[PDB]
Every structure is written in structure tokens, then in C-alpha cells.
Amino acid sequence: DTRTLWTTPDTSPNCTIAQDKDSKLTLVLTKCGSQILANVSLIVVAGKYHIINNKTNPKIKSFTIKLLFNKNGVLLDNSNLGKAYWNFRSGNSNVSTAYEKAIGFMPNLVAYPKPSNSKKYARDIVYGTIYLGGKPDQPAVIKTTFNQETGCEYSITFNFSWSKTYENVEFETTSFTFSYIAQE
Amino acid sequence: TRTLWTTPDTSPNCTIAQDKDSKLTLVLTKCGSQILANVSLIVVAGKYHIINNKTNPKIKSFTIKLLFNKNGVLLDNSNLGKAYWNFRSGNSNVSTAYEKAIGFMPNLVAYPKPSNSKKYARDIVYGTIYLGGKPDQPAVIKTTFNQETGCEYSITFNFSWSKTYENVEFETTSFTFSYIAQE
Amino acid sequence: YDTRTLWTTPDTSPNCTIAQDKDSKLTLVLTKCGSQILANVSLIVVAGKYHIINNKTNPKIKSFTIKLLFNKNGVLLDNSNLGKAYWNFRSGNSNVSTAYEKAIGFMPNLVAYPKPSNSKKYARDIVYGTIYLGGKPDQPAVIKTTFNQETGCEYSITFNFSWSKTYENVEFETTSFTFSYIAQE
Ligand SMILES: CCC(=O)N[C@H]1[C@H]([C@H](O)[C@H](O)CO)O[C@@](OCCn2cc(CN(Cc3cn(CCO[C@]4(C(=O)O)C[C@H](O)[C@@H](NC(=O)CC)[C@H]([C@H](O)[C@H](O)CO)O4)nn3)Cc3cn(CCO[C@]4(C(=O)O)C[C@H](O)[C@@H](NC(=O)CC)[C@H]([C@H](O)[C@H](O)CO)O4)nn3)nn2)(C(=O)O)C[C@@H]1O
Ligand SMILES: [Mg+2]
Ligand SMILES: [Mg+2]
Ligand SMILES: [Zn+2]
Ligand SMILES: [Zn+2]
Ligand SMILES: [Zn+2]
């Protein structure tokens, strides 16, 4: 499937926030021509962000997952998402060898330029809210930013944050859909 | 081939509390591995038509279920009626009831059926729509994939609200979401 | 030449007139996924009345509207707030060289979203979202999008921006929002 990059939809940890493989990021990018249709959720399985307790830890209120890409749209190893887990769809799994090119899935650099001395516009951000444990009283903000990281040609970053004082709440989320303008 | 829908008319096609009390307008468009979904609801009669939470404070939510078999065919005991749920042709439907739509079904690995395994929240999408198009009349639309029994796939819409509405007609703005496709 | 996308281009060159000529860049991308249009929108105000919001100074400045009006062929009418010059089918990061003559497949569906009439008016022709000024999560503004409710046109898409906080010297430039709507054909 040449039109979807994804993480497979299983629950196998693939992401490192605070410690190795502490999370499963489920991310599906579907190319609808000039726009990428994106669907995301997160399951934290272990470590610092698995169970939030803001009584115990009042300043644990946010964290970031970064996807960094080179000029060919290939995932770079400083990304929180592991390289072995990210590929074009084949059935419910991934192609068995790493892809060489995915520029058509990258966030457009004219729409979303890299940091510079020029005025920075907010249109490179999408805000949404997801819900921990599927409970409507457990919001957390998912802030997605395009092309704002260094050490790469392109980037997608997910910042998760919350303003409520959660007491023993597992960090596993509902799903959110957004889109962005494609590089080509 | 590419869009399954209810048609865009306002003819009731859904039974929440009594027969044909509502029009669910639902459009599913297959963009490969994801289904792009667009939904709204008009209740025209019955218990959920005109909401008054001063006289009936406990009337705060209701559910509309779409149940599908192994071939993605809508089951008769869904709240949505089978008659006008089909692949699009113009502003109407193809003239033959579809036999297969597995590519429009919610992915079972992403969204497993109920079991004794852990239930993860990623099979839910939350949104908010607005009654009467008024920005001070929110209601929550909670969409859940593959959590019904007696089917192979399902999409469930739970509508709820926390405001104390006084004689407010339950007809909504539109909401867009997506989900991971079975194949 | 990308016939599946109508857009404004992704640059920041002003293309829109809210209160004075070319006071803003509306970035709007309509991508045809068959029976649905997948839409992505943001707004940058660069000058005039809506550039810098100060509701201490001007407590009544709380909202504005950007209208896109279309004829029977889906062509943008020149009384739209959006200018015709760079609304066109995509070619790379720019537009196709000549103005389009037909884009009916990008128009909002008139049965889903009928023009005003004696018949009951339903809310399903509206999409509500919230965007954030300056990308700050404590600076919400509501983006209300309405299909086919303007007169003097075959089809319309209108964006109403409003806020309910007392902003003091907040520049009106937004995060992005995605929605979809049912296409006419
Ligand atoms: C989808 C599921 C869901 O909605 N879950 C919510 C959950 C459930 O509804 C209930 O649990 C079910 O029973 O409720 C949650 O909250 C419950 C408590 N609660 C309190 C109030 C009274 N409010 C409380 C309040 C909180 N704030 C914080 C400041 O607000 C902002 C800000 O900084 O300006 C708003 C920003 O959007 C937000 N940013 C983001 O979310 C980023 C994505 C920020 C940030 O969260 C913080 O800054 C941290 O960075 O916070 N302020 N107040 C005071 C209050 C009262 N009202 C009444 C007016 O509300 C409406 C209305 O009904 O008229 C609500 C409409 O939705 C709104 N319409 C629109 O937005 C159209 C698009 C409408 C209009 O704006 C208005 O009429 C003008 O036209 O206003 N408003 N504020 N209420 N509930 C929970 O359990 O935690 C939240 C769950 O999300
Ligand atoms: Mg609770
Ligand atoms: Mg009111
Ligand atoms: Zn645990
Ligand atoms: Zn009614
Ligand atoms: Zn400025």
C-alpha cells in the first residue's frame, strides 16, 4: 500500500518517551493528494508517563514525541518513534524492508517553514483534545507542530499536556484526526 | 465504490426511541487505509426531539448503533434502517443493495471486539456538535468502533449533554472524523 | 497540474479583504476525496481593523466574516472576500497558469446544504471549530463555517471568526483546522 505510512495498528511498544519502548504510538498517514489525512492515538505502557499522579508529581504535566525526517522523508533515529516500526502498509503489517522515499507524505515547507529569522506563523500548529481512558472528564491537549525541529529536513511533533490534577490516571488515549498540506 | 452513505435528504431513516424518529446523515468515504466520515443528526419526533432538562433533568443521552456482518452489510437490528444505506449514485444510491463493504469496516486489530483483554481507548473518537447551529448549545458525540456484540463490526454514536436545555430541538451541526479501515 | 486540489497556494502573500484591501492571507486547501471535500484552513491578518485585537480599547470588535461565493460552474465571484487571482487548481506550490472554468465537484452539496427558503432550516450546513491565536492554547477563537447560506450565488462557503475573551494586543493569526463536507457531485 503505497498511499499509507503507518505504525501497524497492534499494541506492541514502538516509542521511547522517557525510557526504552515505554509507549505505542499509533499513527496512520494516508495520502489524499495535496493533503495527508492523519490519525493518531497513544498508549503509554511503562515508565514515568504510564500512570499520572499529580499529587505525587505536581510538575509532570506534559511530554513530547518527535518524528524527524530527512530530505527523502525517511525517519531519523533521534525520533522517539523507532525506525523498525514505521513503513508503508502491507495488510495489517508493514513492508518487510525499509522504504527509500516518502516525500509526498512530508509537511509542506512553504506552508510550514523551518525556524528562521522571519516571522513565525501559527498555521504550522494543529490543536486537538483527546481523552484518557476514554473518559470525557479526562482531557489532554494534543498539540501537533510541523517542521519546527532542527537536525532534519521535515518534522512532525506531538506535544501532550494537561491542566487537570490527575490522580492515578493511565495515559492511554482516544483517537484524533487532522490533516496537513503535503510537500508534493 | 468509494462512498457509502445515507443519502443527503432529510427523510427519517433512524429509530432512537420510536420508529423513524430521526435522520442520521452519515457519509463514509474510503481514502485507502482510512475512512473519512461526516455525520449529523436531526431528531424529528419522540422522546429526544425537544429537550427540556428543567422538567426532565435525567434525559441527558442516547445511542445510535450501526451493526455489520462479516461482509460489511448493515444488520436489520441497527438503529439505522437498511433501505437507504448504500453506495452513492448522484444524490441517491446505486439501485442494487451492496453485498460487500469490508474495506469500509473499522479495523479489528486497531479496534478489537469486546473480550476479556484490556479495552484500550483508541477505539473511541470524541467530538462536539451544536444544537440548532447555536454556539452556546454543545452536545458531545462519542463514536466507538467494534464494541457491540451480535455483529462482526460496529459503529456506535452516543450523544450526550451536560447543559440544562429548555425546549431545545435536537438537530445538529456536522462533524468529521476518520478511522482505520479493515482492509 | 493537480485537478484534485483547489487552493490559495501555501504562501503568505495577502489574498483576502476583511476590512481593507488585502489585509489578510486566507490559506485554504480543498482536496477532493470523491463525495467529500477534505478542507484545511488558517488565517493570517496582516493589517487593518482585525490585525491587532484590543478589546479594552475596542470592546465591540468581537467577530468578522470571510465569504467565498461561487456561480453555477463553481467559479469564485469577485464580490467574495477572497481574491480570484490566486484561487485555482494546484500546480506544485503554485497554481495552474490559466483560470479554471469548472469546479462543480468542489462545491458544497445543495441537497445536504440548501439555500435559504420557506423550508425548515437545519444546522447540518454548519461546522464549528476552534483555532488558537498565535498558537497559544489560552487564545481560542471560534471558526464557524457555513455552506450555501449566502444569496446572489449558486454556492457559498463562509467563515465566521469570533471570540469571547477580552484580548489585549493579540495579533489575529491562527492555527490550522481541518473539516470536510459533502460534494455537489
Ligand atoms: C468531548 C467531551 C468533553 O467535552 N469533555 C469535557 C467535560 C465534559 O463536558 C463533562 O465532564 C461532562 O459532564 O468537561 C470538562 O470540564 C468540566 C468542567 N467545566 C467547567 C466549566 C466552566 N468553565 C470552566 C472553565 C475552564 N476554563 C479554562 C480557560 O479556558 C480555555 C482558555 O484558556 O481560554 C479554553 C481553551 O479552549 C483551552 N485550550 C484548549 O483546550 C487547547 C486545545 C484552554 C486551555 O485548556 C488552558 O488555557 C490550559 O492551557 O482553556 N475556563 N473556564 C468557565 C466557562 C464556562 N463557560 C460557559 C460557556 O461555554 C460554552 C457554552 O456552552 O456557551 C461552551 C461551548 O462549547 C462554546 N462554543 C464553542 O466553543 C463553539 C466552537 C461556547 C462559546 O464559546 C460561548 O457561548 C460564546 O459563544 O461556550 N465557558 N467557560 N464547564 N465545564 C472536564 O470534565 O474536564 C472538559 C472536557 O473537555
Ligand atoms: Mg471521573
Ligand atoms: Mg442562547
Ligand atoms: Zn499499568
Ligand atoms: Zn423538530
Ligand atoms: Zn502582524
Show the 3-state SS of chain A.
CCCEEECCCCCCCCECCCCCCCEEEEEEEEEECCEEEEEEEEEECCCCCCEEECCCCCCCCEEEEEEEECCCCCECCCCCECHHHCEEEECCEECCCCCCCCHHHCECCCCCCCCCCCCCCHHHEEEEEEEECCCCCCEEEEEEEECCCCCCCEEEEEEEECCCCCEEEECEECCEEEEEEECC
Alpha-carbon distances of B77 from B62, B97, B113, B141, rounded to whole Å: 16, 17, 18, 21
Tell me how far the alpha carbon of residue B78 is from its chain's centroid. 10
d(CA A89, CA A5): 6
CATH number at residue A93: 2.60.90.10
Chain A positions contacting chain C at CB under 8 Å are: 32-35, 37, 108, 110-111, 121-127, 141, 143, 161, 177-181, 184
Using CB atoms within 10 A of its CB, is residue A140 exposed (0-12), middle (13-18) or buried (19+)? buried
**DSSP code for B98:** -
Alpha-carbon distances of B150 from B68, B146, B158, C179, rounded to whole Å: 9, 11, 19, 33
Using CB atoms within 10 A of its CB, is residue A14 exposed (0-12), middle (13-18) or buried (19+)? buried
Angle at B3 between CA A184 and CA B4, to 5 degrees: 150
Instruction: Name the amino acid, one letter, at A19.
Output: Q
- Contacting residues of B for A9, CB less than 8 Å apart: 107, 109-110, 180
d(CA A137, CA A130): 10
Q: How far is the CA of B18 from the centre of ligand 6 (A)?
A: 55
The answer to whether A7 and A85 have CB atoms below 8 angstroms apart is yes
Alpha-carbon distances of A73 from A143, C67, C94, rounded to whole Å: 21, 37, 22
Angle at B7 between CA B95 and CA B146, to 5 degrees: 100
d(CA C103, CA C94): 18
A77 contact partners, CB below 8 Å, separation of at least 6:
A83
The answer to whether B173 and C127 have CB atoms below 8 angstroms apart is yes
DSSP B19-83: TT-EEEEEEEEEETTEEEEEEEEEE-SSTTTEEETTT-TT--EEEEEEEE-TTSPBPTTSSB-ST
The answer to whether C23 and C14 have CB atoms below 8 angstroms apart is yes
Domain limits at C108? Answer: 1-185
d(CA C33, CA A7): 23
| Radius of gyration in angstroms for the set of CA atoms belonging to chain B, rounded to a whole number | 16
Mutate to test the pocket of ligand 1, among B60, B125, B134, B136 (most ligand atoms within 8 A of CB): B136
The answer to whether B110 and A9 have CB atoms below 8 angstroms apart is yes
Instruction: Name the amino acid, one letter, at A115.
Output: P
The answer to whether C150 and C67 have CB atoms below 8 angstroms apart is yes
d(CA C26, CA C6): 13
**DSSP code for B96:** S
Residue for cell digits 485585537?
Answer: C53
Closest chain A residue to the Cα of C9, Cα to Cα = A111
d(CA C29, CA A180): 9
The structure was resolved experimentally with X-ray
Domain total for chain C?
1
SS (H, E, C) chain C: CEEEEEECCCCCCCCECCCCCCCEEEEEEEEEECCEEEEEEEEEECCCCCCEEECCCCCCCCEEEEEEEECCCCCECCCCCECCCCCEEEECCEECCCCCCCCHHHCECCCCCCCCCCCCCCHHHEEEEEEEECCCCCCEEEEEEEECCCCCCCEEEEEEEECCCCCEEEECEECCEEEEEEECC
